[PDB]
Subunit: 411 residues, 3 copies
């Protein structure tokens, strides 16, 4: 339904945007009031990212302290983090080399570490430390505005780790933030019911302001960057990581998953294709049932390889749409926030847009340009879910070869 | 006791204010140090409105999710909201037409909706978005200071609704905020024990600074606006709402409540007159015992019709005392905050002053002028409680006629 | 271990600081990057003082509501507060008269009370009210930056008192903040494992910038102020307070504790010397076993007389190192924050440095000068623990004479 009511928001936002621009004449003021229902959506999204980051980081890290089954549980979590970090790095490199959207460096890397450890937890919810080399030179910090996403991710990772080790003493803190993450995931679902009304007026506000045909050549080159990144990650990278640790011809392993990949296109949900990819791994690729019963359940909500690469591409595409280049201190902030968005969205396909707003707010990019991401998101969301279950599929074969001593011992 | 120790604070603040002004000569500096124990009270009141709004909204809305008994529970809650909204609108119209205290408009209505959905939850506790049309014109927001009461009311209404539907999963969040609202209601009682000392020095600071006899003609016209509003609401409005839905001569229904209205004057508590207005509805007006056992218990702490009208009049009277006119974007902010002050004070007659500070802080009005409200509050508090139980009395007759099919089915 | 790895941080910070200054030449920029691992430690310390103050005040005050055993429980708590307030006053007077580190007043005392009751709880976490007499004069407040430690101590004392009286209703709030104080005490232990790396680069940053031999004459006069204060408090004050209430020759009582004082030097922990000072009070000074089983357990984590005097001296020594004099409104802020640091560190010897940062942040002093406190802290920490157990030892003799009717009644 939500795909059908977002495609309807884009089509009726384009039809409104061309029957208003060609049949009327608005000033700079009426074009601001026309895009007002989308401005309300853009601050309903920013409203919810502060309890979403806090609750999902504390609960997701404290859940991983309880889900790790010794060495099989640790090798699957380690594998999910490297492939996500490789898909983000592949997404960063591809969008910087191609550059769709176009036409000191040591004080930016030290501002990265100063923002991971803020001087106050309450100011981290709305302010960021920025430093400035000036005057044989001095260095001055300012504490500019915008939510410090790195300071809240690092604190809630350390806080969520501590409560997991406390056990009985901290069970009221685990239970508090579990109910807090279930509550804000239901508010995110309320905002996503308003979202087709907001995307309609915010797409139509963009169609009024264009005079060129160059914004659509940039959106076509943005889709050809995500689809290039999803093709390099699924054919060149993820078969190679299989072949480094399992010398067993990774393309025969991928053809054995062919029934699970095609149903990842029709349903377009990585968690709703679980009972097909469970049997399609064991009946065909002869993987152990003990590894499959852990890797595929925790992997369908943690291993998001296609989503991480797409968010990395889309945030730098917005930062090239608005004429910036981000340096390097903002590129690492993309690469941490897009990687930690696996935990920061607690296994929900609804939160694909709001994790986009977390990545854009971690740098300071305009969140109103996310409608150009949403207007072509329905085309690419099918192919992200195919890569999200392929990294889960290749994880059952990789963790099994690494844990061959745990399968002669568990019997 | 608390009425006797507030009337003593006003009389000993007037006696101090005329033995200091006529027998001494203070500068602008000693008149500021003289009103210092009242300045401490004015920031002890503002200190507590942030955990009071948050905890009472989350618990009051999550309680209404559990108290609604199908259609009888929904018709009583719907009736309590319309009469409160009518008494506020009647209070706004009367204080604007009479004007006691005297002698763009589209960017103010859109600032109302921008403040209902703030961009950050932590900045909503101390900052408000204001917009500015400038330059063929542009529009700039600024995020000025002062607590965003609408953003916290709307979020905690949506948050309190979500936890009520979660049930077992969110029971730790219901239990957390229940204990948080019981804790801050005990801190409000501690501040109200300091309040006679603070009102003494803050009344006496006003008596020093007057040179006219015009501030008392404005306070007399303020009491003649509340008492006019309580007379129109109890004779013209609330009998008419009975006659629209129950064609049964509403003044005979009101004479049947005459024993409950007179004991609402002596005790001056709408919750402490319950066991008299229970029997006086059934023994006289022949109302069903099944409707009375729900409408009157939840109505004595929710249906506050005389309090809502009085707060609406008093906040615009302060906004006419200090020379303003509020436009229309601040008048709707009165009409939401005074209406939601039924839930925002969890059934306590102590919190009549602090809900006044919530309404004055929702706009940005000076909270130090609440002593002119307090100095005549003991005269009018008797008549507010009579209207607060008359809307409860008329609610048993209205909900019974609307729910005639639920009384042939429940047997 | 932690003493051995901090003495190693000071020695290797002095050896680095003299092989860099004499063998190289840095600009103003490379001297800032050299002290960068210590700058990260200085904002990891400030990060944790906000959940440490809040959780330890709410839990420590709500624990004292449950630990008081009538009159024996009240006399021990009252005795712990006066001796701590006397040792702070003795520390303030000695550092002002000697002045190691060298070479309106009514608007500062009213700013003290305005900051105890802030206008907002969220702004109290990062802002402080300061007032300004200007223009026959007016008075203007500004709300400058820096965390309001007095507003959070006073609120969490009133909040922690209310939850203790609520009992069953507020048991979820006691259980929430107990787990929150156990969680942030484990994060403080993580920061103290980074602390030898941070102190190394922050000591070495000071050795580069000196050209004189005058900073070491000030550090020697700072140790001769703490050791003078610990000698006056343990020989002149605490024997006198014994002799006022117990006419039993206080030096014979102190010689009876000689086995407990010497093991307070070797172990250097006031809580780890409990099973020696239990028997050494009863076997020698013939104190009752009913008073000893309460006074010494709650006193080893509350009665910190040597720590309170040392923090009072060290904060004014930093405020004389950086050329200030603090007036009197900042001296009372030292005397409240150093006194309440008994509750604000929940019985942990790790938190001696972070309570130093709380006292320096309560005024607004530079926290980077705490390395001169740390570099000589290992010399003085042995003698603070001897005074911390001597006030506990003298407390068993004082509370017993005050409670002679409770020991003829309890049998």
């Amino acid at each position: 339904w939500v795909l059908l009511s977002t495609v309807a928001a884009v089509v009726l936002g384009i039809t409104t945007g061309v029957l208003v621009r060609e049949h009327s004449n608005l000033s700079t003021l009426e074009k601001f009031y026309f895009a007002f229902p989308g401005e309300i959506l853009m601050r309903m999204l920013k409203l919810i990212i502060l309890p979403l980051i806090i609750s999902s980081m504390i609960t997701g890290v404290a859940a991983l302290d309880s889900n790790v089954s010794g060495k099989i549980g640790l090798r699957a979590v380690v594998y999910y983090f490297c492939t996500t970090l490789i898909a983000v790095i592949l997404g960063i490199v591809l969008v910087v080399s191609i550059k769709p959207g176009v036409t000191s460096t040591v004080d930016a890397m030290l501002d990265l570490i100063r923002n991971m450890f803020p001087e106050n937890l309450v100011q981290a919810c709305f302010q960021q430390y920025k430093t400035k080399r000036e005057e044989e030179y001095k260095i001055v910090g300012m504490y500019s505005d915008g939510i410090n996403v790195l300071g809240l991710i690092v604190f809630c990772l350390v806080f969520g780790l501590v409560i997991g080790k406390m056990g009985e003493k901290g069970q009221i803190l685990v239970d508090f933030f579990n109910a807090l993450s279930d509550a804000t995931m239901k508010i995110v679902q309320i905002i996503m019911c308003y979202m087709p009304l907001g995307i309609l007026f915010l797409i139509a506000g963009k169609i009024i302001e264009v005079e060129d045909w160059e914004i659509f050549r940039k959106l076509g080159l943005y889709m050809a960057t995500v689809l290039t990144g999803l093709a390099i990650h699924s054919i060149v990278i993820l078969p190679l990581i299989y072949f480094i640790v399992v010398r067993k011809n990774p393309f025969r392993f991928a053809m054995g998953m062919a029934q699970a990949l095609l149903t990842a296109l029709m349903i377009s949900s990585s968690s709703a294709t679980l009972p097909v990819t469970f049997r399609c791994a064991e009946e065909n690729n002869q993987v152990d049932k003990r590894i499959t019963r852990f890797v595929l359940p925790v992997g369908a909500t943690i291993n998001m390889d296609g989503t991480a690469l797409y968010e990395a591409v889309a945030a730098v595409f917005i930062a090239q749409l608005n004429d910036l280049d981000l340096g390097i201190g903002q590129i690492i902030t993309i690469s941490i926030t897009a990687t930690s968005a696996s935990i920061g969205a607690a296994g929900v396909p609804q939160a694909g847009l709001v994790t986009m707003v977390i990545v854009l707010s971690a740098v300071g990019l305009p969140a109103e340009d996310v409608t150009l991401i949403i207007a072509v998101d329905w085309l690419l969301d099918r192919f992200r879910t195919m890569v999200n279950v392929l990294g889960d599929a290749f994880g059952t074969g990789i963790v099994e070869k690494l844990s061959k001593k745990e399968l002669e011992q568990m019997d």
